[PDB]
Write a protein that binds this ligand. Structure first.
Ligand SMILES: [Zn+2]
Ligand SMILES: [Zn+2]
Lengths: 114, 101, 147, 209, 243, 147, 101, 50
């Protein structure tokens, strides 16, 4: 799925079918280094591109005065009452008006979408 | 026949059509000028309505010629107005609503 | 096309005092970074995000044929204001261009090349952020952008 | 599928019978109106490995004034056609002495074949029809008014009434799909009868150039 | 117009050297179902696998059949490509694809297969007519788009029937297809009326468009001047732009 | 922000911005930025207190002026693209005081709102009772008035 | 306003009336609403006048010949009769056919 | 009217708003809100005219 680099010249490896043993390889084109493919997967493309934006939300966002917050939804980990919510804040989100929540109070940063 | 022609020309049935002379204003002008009483029987002969319209439509000339091409040209040019004019001047309409002497 | 459908989106640069477009990786190697782990280390700040990696992947394959810095300065030099008659004239010219007319606010002198990498990578990086839709396209009329 | 292809061929044959009928060629009332199942029972269902091969759909029809002129409608079996193929068709033409024919092209024509259609005017005239152009009758569309191709005497009397030179009439180009529909040639005049919402009927005369 | 990308959830290129290897967890079942009586594999099976997913929503909304997608891919690309698919019972709707078997009997493989994907997602044209972006369906309340029939009393009755309005236009192939009314179908674009229905449909159509835009505001301009503009534009025998 | 409010190492002219989602921190000392002053709010209370207005009403012969009000950290200059990071209140006795909760964090309050109007538009009595094209027409004609 | 506020107040719905007077934010939103009107007023005039000129230049020679045929400068026939019914446009009125529908 | 708008927005936060066919969630949202607000201003207008 991800890209890996050579251990000699630190260049980009490329996948190459092993013809004799029928095992997938990655071989740098600028040297002779070769390493077998562990993941066996190469090119993955998500066309609906559905991605949890919880991975893209920073916890520091909890410090912004300009965002709204409610005391209704408590945190899961620490049970803190303040929760700062905001929408996708992303282009090409398809259509999502879902509210994303970030826990206020220090360092918790827990994120739960409801 | 004229009704069928209208139903060919005007789908969706829009009855508001632009024409040169307003026949309702002219008829209801005649009633007021000559002091017609609708409560009385009319003296107008129902033929001379038809003969009046027929002798009338000849004297409205868009196209000048004796050629058959000219004849069809004038019929196609004055068609709709002749249909309207025969509609408002109809004999039974003279003898019911308007009471024109 | 056959090549366009296979490659995807290639990132190219328009430099000052240079005739036409130039690919990015040739500009990064012209700054002295030979390996692709240094180039993609300046472009992509965390490798654990595969999406940006897939975004950058074709731009490397387009520039694959120039693996040497001086060959890249030769690549740029031929597109200069006028083609240099002697080769190393083109290398010296393109080097002066990368020092002076390239990103003057970063630095004008010698080792600023290193710094000229980061900010320039930033450009490409930020461009990727508009390609993935993770940031908004700047509005030209926003008066924070006006002096 | 063969149901779709057969349905297409039914549209095409029916529309070509309406072509043939509008040009003044003798057509029985059945030839105009054939329910799809009657056509299918006649020509045998599936085209693919089937009864219709795109040959025997060819049509021969005669003119009302004289039987001699007739006409012909080819259906080529190739996706694209070429000079050799048209040359075979014109060989059949000169074999049957029939002057006028049509071609229904599935996709396209090599430009040398179009030029080869324009090459011989007097002997045999051939008119390219794309397959889609005959999938619908455009004369029955609401926007398209009734067209009547005028004989030369009516044209002469026309130019005598309004005292017009031929150049002073409005024009209609020979590449106009309607002009194709009636098979009209440079120099003829067409009489359009269209309804108006002021006069109620209006006649246009379009010279063909 | 529905491209294969619209109904495709995600795509993954896999390397499986053997049919029964099946690095994926779920695939082994129907793979073995088709390979108990494997057919058209006699040459050899390409090691490069292309596994695409299809969202059931987009599939059932358009009344799409997996067999139909196999027919359109296998027909579009010919015998150079091999299509394998699930029954609908699978909660994850999978389509597996392999390079030509007789190709084993340049371009590499994985590069050629990526080119195959990026050619399919845009190119395939599963349904409909290309250049039609969307088609809208509604019952019009305006008497112009309502079908008005004369009943047995001679009266005018206004009927409500569903009508379509497309974003983007191809007039001819829409006119050709079944169940579409040839008589009353019209586009606003003048040229696409010209090259199909001719110059007269451009006369009346252009006239209706000018009357639409001029009378849309609530204004009223007389018939004669519109009728003149359309004539002067269409008099020369072809469209005369005013330029 | 403290060092700017005390004007030690940072002139009050410099603008400083923290854009949280992009992780950047920007500092603009550049010339041409159009910026306007604003009151500062700590928690729900203004930093402008009764002694400040007491000295400003006595401003004559106290040698105490606006500059000493800026040096007290009461008022602060803010430019356009920093306003994206700020929360403003129209008037303190309205938006600062407690009601059914809208916002707590307000960091600033405008001096008086009518100062958003230019010179020619400040001579219009009751400009909010007018249709805006008429405020514009008056901003045009007020330049032509004889006097 | 607070980020991601789609409520009526944040997005420019004006509750107050000119008599009572606007609030400041409603006043600024109102100015934004008027600027589009001023801009449309200024921009449309040039395109309208240019289209006017093009129409006049294209039509300038069209006239009614003594045959009532509508012919341009070259005597080419645009229409056989003017307005297709051959009548001037000022003296006409709206009417109802009344034979239709 | 404003309370109704709050109800609709609080529907859209929980995703309960179903997109009208042919409309993005933003399009159907703006459509609904425009319906409510135009109903408001029209009704108040008719009242002032009474
Ligand atoms: Zn290596
Ligand atoms: Zn917490």
């Amino acid at each position: 799925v991800g890209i890996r680099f050579c251990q000699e010249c630190n260049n980009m490896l490329y996948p190459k079918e092993d013809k004799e043993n029928r095992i997938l390889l990655y071989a740098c084109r600028n040297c002779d280094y070769q390493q077998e493919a562990d993941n066996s997967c190469i090119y993955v493309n998500k066309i609906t591109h559905e991605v949890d934006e919880l991975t893209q939300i920073i916890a520091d966002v909890s410090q912004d005065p300009t965002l709204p917050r409610t005391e209704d939804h408590p945190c899961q980990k620490c049970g803190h009452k303040e929760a700062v919510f905001f929408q996708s804040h992303s282009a090409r989100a398809e259509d999502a008006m879902r509210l994303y929540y970030v826990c206020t109070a220090p360092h918790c940063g827990h994120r739960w979408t409801e | 026949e004229d009704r069928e022609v209208l139903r060919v020309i005007f789908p969706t049935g829009d009855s508001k059509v632009v024409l040169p002379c307003n026949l309702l204003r002219m008829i209801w002008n005649a009633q007021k000028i000559f002091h017609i009483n609708p409560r009385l029987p009319s003296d107008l002969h129902p033929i001379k309505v038809v003969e009046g319209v027929k002798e009338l439509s000849k004297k409205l000339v868009i196209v000048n010629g004796d050629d058959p091409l000219s004849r069809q040209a004038q019929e196609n040019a004055t068609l709709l107005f002749n249909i309207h004019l025969r509609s408002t001047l109809c004999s039974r309409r003279m003898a019911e609503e308007f009471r024109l002497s | 096309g056959a090549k366009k459908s296979a490659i995807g989106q290639r990132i190219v640069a328009t430099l000052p005092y240079i005739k036409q477009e130039v690919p990015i990786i040739i500009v990064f190697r012209a700054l002295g970074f030979v390996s692709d782990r240094d180039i993609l280390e300046h472009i992509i700040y965390d490798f654990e995000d595969p999406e940006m990696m897939e975004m950058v992947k074709p731009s490397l394959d387009e520039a694959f044929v120039i693996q040497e810095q001086n060959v890249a300065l030769n690549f740029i030099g031929s597109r200069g204001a006028k083609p240099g008659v002697t080769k190393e004239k083109r290398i010296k010219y393109a080097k002066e261009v990368l020092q002076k007319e390239m990103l003057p606010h970063v630095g004008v002198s010698d080792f600023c090349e290193t710094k000229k990498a980061y900010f320039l990578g930033y450009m490409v990086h930020r461009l990727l952020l508009a390609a993935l839709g993770r940031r908004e396209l700047d509005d030209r009329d926003h008066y924070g952008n006006k002096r | 599928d063969d149901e779709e292809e057969t349905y297409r061929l039914w549209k095409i044959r029916k529309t070509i019978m309406q072509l043939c009928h509008d040009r003044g060629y003798l057509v029985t009332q059945d030839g105009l109106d054939q329910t799809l199942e009657e056509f299918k029972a006649q020509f045998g269902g599936k085209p693919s490995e089937g009864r219709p091969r795109r040959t025997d759909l060819t049509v021969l029809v005669a003119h009302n004034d004289d039987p001699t002129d007739q006409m012909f409608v080819f259906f080529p079996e190739e996706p694209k056609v070429g000079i050799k193929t048209i040359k075979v068709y014109c060989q059949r033409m000169q074999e049957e002495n029939i002057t006028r024919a049509l071609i229904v092209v599935q996709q396209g024509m090599t430009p040398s074949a179009k030029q080869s259609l324009v090459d011989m005017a007097p002997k045999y005239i051939l008119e390219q029809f794309l397959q889609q152009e005959l999938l619908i009758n455009i004369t029955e569309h609401e926007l398209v008014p009734e067209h009547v191709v005028m004989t030369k005497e009516e044209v002469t009397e026309l130019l005598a009434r309004y005292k017009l030179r031929e150049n002073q009439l409005p024009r209609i180009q020979a590449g106009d799909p309607v002009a194709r529909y009636f098979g009209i040639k440079r120099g003829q005049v067409v009489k359009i009868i269209r309804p108006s919402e002021t006069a109620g009927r209006y006649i246009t005369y379009r010279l063909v150039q | 117009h529905t491209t294969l990308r619209k109904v495709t959830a995600n795509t993954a290129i896999y390397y499986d050297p053997n049919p029964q290897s099946t690095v994926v967890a779920e695939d082994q079942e129907w793979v073995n179902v088709y390979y108990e009586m494997p057919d058209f594999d006699v040459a050899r099976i390409s090691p490069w696998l292309l596994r695409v997913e299809l969202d059931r929503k987009h599939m059932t909304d358009r009344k799409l059949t997996m067999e139909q997608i196999a027919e359109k891919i296998n027909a579009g690309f010919g015998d150079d490509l091999n299509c394998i698919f699930n029954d609908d019972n699978a909660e994850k709707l999978v389509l597996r694809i392999r390079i030509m078997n007789s190709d084993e009997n340049k371009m590499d493989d994985d590069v050629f297969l990526r080119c195959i994907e990026s050619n399919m997602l845009t190119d395939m044209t599963l349904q409909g007519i290309e250049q039609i972006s969307k088609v809208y369906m509604h019952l019009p309340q305006t008497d112009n788009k309502k079908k008005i029939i004369i009943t047995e009393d001679g009266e005018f009755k206004a009927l409500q029937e569903w009508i379509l309005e497309t974003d983007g236009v191809s007039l001819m192939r829409v006119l050709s297809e079944k169940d579409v009314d040839p008589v009353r179908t019209t586009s606003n674009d003048i040229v696409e009326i010209f090259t199909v229905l001719g110059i007269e449909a451009v006369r009346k159509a252009l006239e209706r468009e000018l009357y639409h835009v001029i009378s849309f505001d609530g204004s009223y301009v007389n018939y004669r001047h519109l009728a003149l503009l359309c004539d002067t534009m269409t008099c020369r025998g072809h469209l005369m732009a005013i330029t | 922000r403290k060092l700017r409010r005390q004007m030690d190492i940072i002139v009050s002219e410099v603008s400083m911005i923290r854009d949280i989602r992009e992780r950047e921190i920007r500092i603009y000392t550049d010339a041409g930025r159009i910026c306007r002053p604003l009151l500062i709010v700590e928690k729900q209370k203004l930093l402008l207190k009764k002694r400040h207005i007491d000295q400003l009403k006595e401003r004559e012969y106290n040698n105490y002026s606006w500059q000493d009000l800026v040096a007290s950290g009461v008022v602060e200059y803010i430019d356009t693209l920093e306003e994206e990071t700020v929360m403003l209140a129209m008037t303190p006795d309205d938006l600062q005081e407690k009601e059914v909760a809208y916002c707590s964090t307000y960091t600033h309050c405008e001096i008086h709102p009518s100062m958003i109007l230019g010179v020619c538009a400040s001579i219009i009595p009751f400009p909010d009772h007018n249709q805006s094209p008429r405020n514009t027409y008056q901003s045009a004609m007020g330049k032509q008035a004889m006097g | 306003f607070i980020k991601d506020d789609y409520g009526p107040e944040s997005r420019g719905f004006v509750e107050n009336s000119y008599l009572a007077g606007l609030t400041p934010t409603e006043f600024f939103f109102h100015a934004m609403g008027g600027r589009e009107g001023l801009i449309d007023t200024a921009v449309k005039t040039a395109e309208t006048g240019y289209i006017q000129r093009r129409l006049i230049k294209s039509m300038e020679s069209v006239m009614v010949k003594y045959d009532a045929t509508v012919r341009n400068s070259i005597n080419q026939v645009v229409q056989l009769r003017y307005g297709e019914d051959g009548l001037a446009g000022e003296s006409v009125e709206f009417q109802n056919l009344a034979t239709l529908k | 009217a404003k309370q109704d708008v709050i109800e609709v927005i609080e529907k859209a936060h929980n995703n309960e708003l179903e997109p009208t066919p042919g409309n993005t969630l933003r399009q159907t949202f703006e459509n609904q809100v425009n319906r409510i607000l135009n109903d408001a201003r029209d009704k108040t207008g008719s009242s002032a005219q009474k």
